[PDB]
Amino acid sequence: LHKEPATLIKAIDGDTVKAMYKGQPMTFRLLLVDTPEFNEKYGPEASAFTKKMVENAKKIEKEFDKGQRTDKYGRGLAYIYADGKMVNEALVRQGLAKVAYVYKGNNTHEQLLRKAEAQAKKEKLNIWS
Numbered sequence: 001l002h003k004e005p006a007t008l009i010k011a012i013d014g015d016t017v018k019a020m021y022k023g024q025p026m027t028f029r030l031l032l033v034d035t036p037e038f039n040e041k042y043g044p045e046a047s048a049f050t051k052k053m054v055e056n057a058k059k060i061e062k063e064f065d066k067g068q069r070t071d072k073y074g075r076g077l078a079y080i081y082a083d084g085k086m087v088n089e090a091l092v093r094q095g096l097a098k099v100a101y102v103y104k105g106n107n108t109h110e111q112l113l114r115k116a117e118a119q120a121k122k123e124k125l126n127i128w129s
């Protein structure tokens, strides 16, 4: 896969952000992860982690996988990087997201994220506490 530039409009919650994609404001949904909803346990924490990671970055980038680039809701589906660090992976590593929604042909970073999830589980972090 390859990274490409992204233009952040605003973070929304733990696993969605709003981006300007070819001049269209568009929600992007992070691939391979599920954060809690904002008013569920660890919701506000997952939101804040994603928000600070993308807002405080010098650069956001996105990376499409090989399959669907949009979901049934018109959301873009990507891996998002903040100054080269993958937000999807960081959330899982800190126990703020589960690996989830793994579909064949959009699963390039599956094993990387499962390695992070196992470490968060071993450390009993957040969701796994």
Ligand SMILES: Cc1cn([C@H]2C[C@H](OP(=O)(O)O)[C@@H](COP(=O)(O)O)O2)c(=O)[nH]c1=O
Binding pocket: 029, 030, 031, 032, 033, 034, 071, 072, 077, 101
């Ligand atoms: C992450 C992801 C979610 N989705 C869909 C599955 C769920 O659809 P259904 O709503 O029909 O169950 C929904 C979960 O999104 P959220 O976790 O953002 O609520 O988005 C995809 O189709 N592909 C994906 O890669």
Ligand SMILES: [Ca+2]
Binding pocket: 015, 034, 035, 036, 037
């Ligand atoms: Ca969610």
